[PDB]
Write a protein that binds this ligand. Sequence first.
Ligand SMILES: *[C@@H]1O[C@H](CO)[C@@H](O[C@@H]2O[C@H](CO)[C@@H](O)[C@H](O)[C@H]2NC(C)=O)[C@H](O)[C@H]1NC(C)=O
Ligand SMILES: *[C@@H]1O[C@H](CO)[C@@H](O[C@@H]2O[C@H](CO)[C@@H](O)[C@H](O)[C@H]2NC(C)=O)[C@H](O)[C@H]1NC(C)=O
Ligand SMILES: *[C@@H]1O[C@H](CO)[C@@H](O[C@@H]2O[C@H](CO)[C@@H](O)[C@H](O)[C@H]2NC(C)=O)[C@H](O)[C@H]1NC(C)=O
Ligand SMILES: *[C@@H]1O[C@H](CO)[C@@H](O[C@@H]2O[C@H](CO)[C@@H](O)[C@H](O)[C@H]2NC(C)=O)[C@H](O)[C@H]1NC(C)=O
Ligand SMILES: *[C@@H]1O[C@H](CO)[C@@H](O[C@@H]2O[C@H](CO)[C@@H](O)[C@H](O)[C@H]2NC(C)=O)[C@H](O)[C@H]1NC(C)=O
Ligand SMILES: *[C@@H]1O[C@H](CO)[C@@H](O)[C@H](O)[C@H]1NC(C)=O
Ligand SMILES: *[C@@H]1O[C@H](CO)[C@@H](O)[C@H](O)[C@H]1NC(C)=O
Ligand SMILES: *[C@@H]1O[C@H](CO)[C@@H](O)[C@H](O)[C@H]1NC(C)=O
Ligand SMILES: *[C@@H]1O[C@H](CO)[C@@H](O)[C@H](O)[C@H]1NC(C)=O
Ligand SMILES: *[C@@H]1O[C@H](CO)[C@@H](O)[C@H](O)[C@H]1NC(C)=O
Ligand SMILES: *[C@@H]1O[C@H](CO)[C@@H](O)[C@H](O)[C@H]1NC(C)=O
Ligand SMILES: *[C@@H]1O[C@H](CO)[C@@H](O)[C@H](O)[C@H]1NC(C)=O
Ligand SMILES: *[C@@H]1O[C@H](CO)[C@@H](O)[C@H](O)[C@H]1NC(C)=O
Ligand SMILES: *[C@@H]1O[C@H](CO)[C@@H](O)[C@H](O)[C@H]1NC(C)=O
Ligand SMILES: *[C@@H]1O[C@H](CO)[C@@H](O)[C@H](O)[C@H]1NC(C)=O
Ligand SMILES: *[C@@H]1O[C@H](CO)[C@@H](O)[C@H](O)[C@H]1NC(C)=O
Ligand SMILES: *[C@@H]1O[C@H](CO)[C@@H](O)[C@H](O)[C@H]1NC(C)=O
Lengths: 212, 424, 419, 149
Amino acid sequence: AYTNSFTRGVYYPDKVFRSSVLHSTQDLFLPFFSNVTWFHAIHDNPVLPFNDGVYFASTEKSNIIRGWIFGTTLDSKTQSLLIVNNATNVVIKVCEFQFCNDPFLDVNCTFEYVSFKNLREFVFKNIDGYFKIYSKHTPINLVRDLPQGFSALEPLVDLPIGINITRFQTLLALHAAYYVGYLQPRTFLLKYNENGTITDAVDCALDPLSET
Amino acid sequence: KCTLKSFTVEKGIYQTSNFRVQPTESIVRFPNITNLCPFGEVFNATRFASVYAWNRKRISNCVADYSVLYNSASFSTFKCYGVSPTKLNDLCFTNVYADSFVIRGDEVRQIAPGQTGKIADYNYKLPDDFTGCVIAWNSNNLDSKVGGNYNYRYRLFRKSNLKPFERDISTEIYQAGSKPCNGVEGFNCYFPLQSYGFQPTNGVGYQPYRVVVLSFELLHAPATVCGPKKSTNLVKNKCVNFNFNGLTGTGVLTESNKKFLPFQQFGRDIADTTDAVRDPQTLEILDITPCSFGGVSVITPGTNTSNQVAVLYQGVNCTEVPVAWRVYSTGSNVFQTRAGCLIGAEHVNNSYECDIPIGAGICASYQTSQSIIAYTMSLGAENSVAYSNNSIAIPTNFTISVTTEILPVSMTKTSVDCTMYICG
Amino acid sequence: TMSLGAENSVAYSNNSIAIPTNFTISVTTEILPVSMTKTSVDCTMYICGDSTECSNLLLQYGSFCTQLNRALTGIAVEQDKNTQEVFAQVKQIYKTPPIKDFGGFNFSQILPDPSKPSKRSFIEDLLFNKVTKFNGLTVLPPLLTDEMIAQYTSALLAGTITSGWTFGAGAALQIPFAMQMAYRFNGIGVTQNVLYENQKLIANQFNSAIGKIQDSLSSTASALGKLQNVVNQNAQALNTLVKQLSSNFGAISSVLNDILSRLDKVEAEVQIDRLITGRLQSLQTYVTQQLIRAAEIRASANLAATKMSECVLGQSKRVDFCGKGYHLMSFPQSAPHGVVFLHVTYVPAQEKNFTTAPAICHDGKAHFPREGVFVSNGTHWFVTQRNFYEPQIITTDNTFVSGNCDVVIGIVNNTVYDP
Amino acid sequence: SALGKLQNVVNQNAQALNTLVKQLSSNFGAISSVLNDILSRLDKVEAEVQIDRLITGRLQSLQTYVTQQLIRAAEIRASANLAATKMSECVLGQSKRVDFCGKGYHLMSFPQSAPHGVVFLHVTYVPAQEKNFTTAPAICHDGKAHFPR
Ligand SMILES: *[C@@H]1O[C@H](CO)[C@@H](O[C@@H]2O[C@H](CO)[C@@H](O)[C@H](O)[C@H]2NC(C)=O)[C@H](O)[C@H]1NC(C)=O
Ligand SMILES: *[C@@H]1O[C@H](CO)[C@@H](O[C@@H]2O[C@H](CO)[C@@H](O)[C@H](O)[C@H]2NC(C)=O)[C@H](O)[C@H]1NC(C)=O
Ligand SMILES: *[C@@H]1O[C@H](CO)[C@@H](O[C@@H]2O[C@H](CO)[C@@H](O)[C@H](O)[C@H]2NC(C)=O)[C@H](O)[C@H]1NC(C)=O
Ligand SMILES: *[C@@H]1O[C@H](CO)[C@@H](O[C@@H]2O[C@H](CO)[C@@H](O)[C@H](O)[C@H]2NC(C)=O)[C@H](O)[C@H]1NC(C)=O
Ligand SMILES: *[C@@H]1O[C@H](CO)[C@@H](O[C@@H]2O[C@H](CO)[C@@H](O)[C@H](O)[C@H]2NC(C)=O)[C@H](O)[C@H]1NC(C)=O
Ligand SMILES: *[C@@H]1O[C@H](CO)[C@@H](O)[C@H](O)[C@H]1NC(C)=O
Ligand SMILES: *[C@@H]1O[C@H](CO)[C@@H](O)[C@H](O)[C@H]1NC(C)=O
Ligand SMILES: *[C@@H]1O[C@H](CO)[C@@H](O)[C@H](O)[C@H]1NC(C)=O
Ligand SMILES: *[C@@H]1O[C@H](CO)[C@@H](O)[C@H](O)[C@H]1NC(C)=O
Ligand SMILES: *[C@@H]1O[C@H](CO)[C@@H](O)[C@H](O)[C@H]1NC(C)=O
Ligand SMILES: *[C@@H]1O[C@H](CO)[C@@H](O)[C@H](O)[C@H]1NC(C)=O
Ligand SMILES: *[C@@H]1O[C@H](CO)[C@@H](O)[C@H](O)[C@H]1NC(C)=O
Ligand SMILES: *[C@@H]1O[C@H](CO)[C@@H](O)[C@H](O)[C@H]1NC(C)=O
Ligand SMILES: *[C@@H]1O[C@H](CO)[C@@H](O)[C@H](O)[C@H]1NC(C)=O
Ligand SMILES: *[C@@H]1O[C@H](CO)[C@@H](O)[C@H](O)[C@H]1NC(C)=O
Ligand SMILES: *[C@@H]1O[C@H](CO)[C@@H](O)[C@H](O)[C@H]1NC(C)=O
Ligand SMILES: *[C@@H]1O[C@H](CO)[C@@H](O)[C@H](O)[C@H]1NC(C)=O
């Protein structure tokens, strides 16, 4: 199952303020008007390969999704990234153990850290060996698809974990929709406004006018 | 006089110098952490790991007195790349990593950027622009045990050619056999962990050497590993020298409404140069300018008329150059203009035609009591044609003018024998 | 495949002429650059950023930074000179008369407006509205301010309106404007009674043609393209020179203080020499392209000064030199970095065929026109001036004689009258 | 100071040549400005590194001079074409072109030679001593309009 990304999946590329400038930079970004894989909250939560990095988003009203797992193999042999919001806190850990084996969450792990209408958006990538997370929340009103428009995701964390991620999966509260696409290296044009908000962008490779 | 290589100067306006406001104070601001970095855990641990299994440690959020390591004369090498070794006590970093192991002393060569050989190709590698320090010392007092410390091991071979900072632990036999080796030795089929017999009686290169590689997460981003450094009281709205976390500069530090999101640490200009910082100990967004500067145009009649002189400081206000030359800054009178601050020249309202040009309609001349005067130039005299719908004027006489005009037509023909010029 | 325009066959013969029976005035804009933005750069501050260590090292290159200063100072000074060459030709500030009865012609769009904060015309404000860093770089004022330029375009225009050619050669002489246009018409082979017999039509065409130019200048910025290029190019060259501060040239950083803080001299000075070598080569590149671009403007300034003297101060005979059609008169208007001319020209407008012959025989003698041309309506023979149909009876006044009929190709018989 | 337009061309060439000679004295990062020092001091294997700095520096100084002279010669050539034009139009003729052959109404021009240049003496008529008159564009007599020749 699929739909179209349009111009979703921009994030602040560097820890810097700029304003009133059409600045441009090269990084892993979601390519414009590319397809995305489509899912909804029935039975719908398989393991996925991670590639060079994941754009992930979900449209919810009640937090059906509570977390994610990432790693080589999720196997109780190697320390593997676990992410949860445990209703009181954001929680992050690198467990080997299948203490819960399935994506089901009930209604020695070295590194650890703690802190439809709701569209949650994320970008996950690994560079420096560090796991880098970018985020957004917004109200939405379109039912089937990622809403055609623009919003730049904000950084969260830059975690020293060093994991060979090749696979990942999401985690569900058990006794809404979600979407996936993959980053690629692109040069982007980025529109920093007067208040230093990224307000619009161009995927230069998209078509000959975008190159122009 | 010296600007023109001459003992005599003609009437004009001359460039002579580029003035700059000097820094009034030297600010330092720093990450606020005080806990000393864990160098005892790095350098004085019971064993460093086997060289195929080289250990790694993160250093973060601590104060790094590298003088401690620099004074450790036991270091058979203390080589650094991208930093001169003593500068580590003031330069600072986001994180630093220590890699560590014991090696055969002969093979210490391979612990440098661009190296080749069994370790460099198969079990430890530095990147081509390795930034940081390599430390090694003879450890034959500890890591030799009459050969019986055979725990220290490396690849002879394997076709898995190694990346910089690649960890590996694999014990699989080299599979490249005359037959697929599949757990059984033979031609190319060998176990992947050749060893050092660390005897105290080893030759000085066969002996064990302990190793530390400090590799630096050296970036403009938030520093957390930093040398011991004072943080001063702040100065605002005045020209100062400054340092923030290792970021040097000179400028006016000033208050701002640059609305940094919580992750944004620096403001950048349109040409992407730093123009604001969040103070590391106060978290105010300081907006920043260079300290004030400008050309020093000297205005003079010819020396053959007078030695008396005036100065134009271009672009700057008089209120930002109240310095002290001594006399030619107090000047008895000083006139602000659209071109800059003008000192010593006497302002006058009478609009003569222009003599020495300042700019933006201002000119200067030497005049009566003699002084350099400055005034708004005339455009020429005013006139009013008596136009009326039936009125004509006709000349009743004439005069024949002779008017000179002068044109260049040629310039000196020359040639240069460029081998005789260059090579003599 | 592009078309080179409409295809036309002219109805030529050994005996056919077309003569225009009516005219139109027109007013055509021409725009010229005169003076680009006056820059200056201290190479010592640009290259070395107040590092004394770097500054000492830069002295090994000798007289480079002093000659690059001298070169940009040469360019920067002649921008005032160009602006002096073009506008400051008039030796007095002539001012406009208080009464506007210029025979019905209406200059109120191009004369200065006293309501304005800076004393510009209505049309000069359209021009001014259509036309659109600290690293040891500097930018300098012109000598003449934009308000002073508007005084010279006021003076040139007031002298032209009130006194014709005369204020160029001598002192300005008053003359009624209707007579000034009669003597301009008489300069293009159209007999001056053609103006007086049509003065209200001509004034109505002229006032309407001035009116259309506000609408032209309101319609598009693309008309100002020549001036807008000057602004674009110097801003593009400067931003290229500023971004070059960030380039590595193979040094470990382009922020010079990184080298000076991370490294001691024996390592540092080679890295500093890469940045020096880079920035100095990049600054020679900027200065060299400015010297070439300055000469490109200089030829445009000397062309503008030539049109100012040959057209505004006179009446140019030279085809297409001051507007298409037969040239009558021109008015300057001031603008950002340049000048605008409103050339006024006469265009013949309604063609008619006539039969023609080079000569007439009458008394056994060949007759030729003293001025103008022989023509016939198919029964009668007349003479007319060349540029406007005005048929007159042929007489010994408007003709002169040379020899017997027999030598001329295509002579025709008619009477010639003797009054 | 009338002849500054010629004297400047002499001064600019003197300045350019002196600057071109003086750049022989600059080190360009070699151990000496004088090539015989390196050849008397150093073994060839090291001298070939030092000399490459002097070649690079001296060559960059020479290219700058030649580039500059190409531009300066193009300015003189524009002035020479203009001089040749005033020669044909003002000396061999009489010009209708306002202010081209000197200020006023043009009569005649005489050339005189000068170093690196030419000087013209333009001879021009200039009107003087106005009187006012009343005027009218036409005359009426017998009801006909008469206009002047
Ligand atoms: C990163 O993980 C991947 C698997 O998630 C590793 O590659 C595979 O390793 C298995 C043996 O464990 C091989 O059979 C496969 O052939 C490998 N995959 C491919 C595409 O060849 C990979 O080696 C890991 N790398 C590191 C540095 O940990
Ligand atoms: C010459 O052409 C002009 C138009 O370009 C004619 O002027 C118009 O004449 C008619 C009457 O014939 C008027 O209604 C219009 O208002 C006139 N136009 C203007 C702008 O005033 C003119 O008549 C022609 N001349 C001759 C002799 O035919
Ligand atoms: C000269 O022409 C201008 C327009 O070019 C005339 O200005 C108009 O004047 C009337 C009042 O007479 C106003 O109602 C209009 O609004 C004015 N037009 C504009 C564009 O402002 C002016 O009247 C003419 N003067 C003479 C003496 O002919
Ligand atoms: C050629 O022009 C002449 C003058 O306009 C015309 O001759 C006059 O014609 C009118 C009638 O249209 C007569 O009343 C006059 O007596 C004629 N005058 C003379 C001196 O003969 C002539 O008709 C025109 N011919 C054509 C073919 O148009
Ligand atoms: C022009 O008029 C003359 C008469 O004034 C014509 O001359 C006659 O021409 C014929 C034929 O050549 C001769 O037979 C006569 O002897 C000529 N007479 C005279 C007095 O010369 C002449 O032909 C006319 N030409 C045209 C083209 O009209
Ligand atoms: C996106 O997926 C659809 C199937 O749902 C496919 O038909 C389409 O070709 C894909 N998009 C592009 C741009 O090819
Ligand atoms: C979430 O984890 C924290 C410890 O980090 C714990 O105190 C809290 O009780 C947990 N909440 C739930 C609902 O498990
Ligand atoms: C704990 O993790 C380490 C690696 O981090 C591993 O060596 C060890 O075998 C693990 N122990 C258990 C009980 O899984
Ligand atoms: C900047 O943000 C403020 C609120 O923080 C908003 O009111 C203002 O309109 C914005 N200005 C611009 C130029 O975007
Ligand atoms: C290591 O131990 C010795 C004493 O055995 C001590 O003098 C030295 O300061 C220690 N060095 C570090 C880096 O902790
Ligand atoms: C930094 O430390 C000083 C004392 O050294 C203290 O006064 C100040 O509150 C601290 N600030 C922060 C943000 O830690
Ligand atoms: C220099 O002095 C002489 C007399 O000694 C005088 O004629 C000349 O005008 C003076 N010129 C200047 C520029 O002072
Ligand atoms: C000069 O500085 C003063 C304040 O020191 C300021 O009031 C004034 O407006 C400034 N004038 C100019 C022309 O910069
Ligand atoms: C010059 O003019 C100003 C007003 O513009 C006046 O205050 C001042 O007294 C005048 N000074 C002289 C020397 O005339
Ligand atoms: C002139 O007459 C010829 C007769 O063939 C005709 O072709 C042409 O169009 C006419 N031109 C004008 C200006 O009347
Ligand atoms: C003019 O040309 C016509 C044919 O086009 C011819 O009959 C006639 O003789 C010619 N006349 C002259 C004077 O050339
Ligand atoms: C011509 O007469 C008028 C009368 O008002 C006068 O203004 C003008 O100055 C006189 N011009 C000459 C040249 O006498």
